Amino acid sequence: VINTDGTMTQEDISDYVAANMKDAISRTSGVGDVQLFGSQYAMRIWMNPNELN
C-alpha cells in the first residue's frame, strides 16, 4: 500500500492496512498467518527522564 505524491509514513499506511483488513484476511477460511509490513497504531507515551527525575 502507498500514497502517490505526498508520502504518509510507514505507520500511517500501516495503520490503515492493519485496521480494516487484517481483521478479515486472517479470518478468511483458507489462510494461515498474516505478517503485516509496518505496524498498527498504539498509544505511544514517551517518558521524559529529566522531567521525571
Find where cell 502507498 sits.
2
> Interface with its own copies includes 20 (CB under 8 A)?
yes
Q: Which is nearer to its own copies, 29 or 53 (CB)?
A: 29
Q: Coil, strand or helix: which one is 48?
A: coil
Those residues with Cβ within 8 angstroms of residue 3's Cβ, 6 or more apart along the chain or in another chain:
13
In angstroms, give the least distance from the CB of 23 to its own copies. Answer: 4
> Interface with its own copies includes 35 (CB under 8 A)?
no
* Site for its own copies, rule CB under 8 A: 1-6, 8, 13, 16, 20-21, 23-33
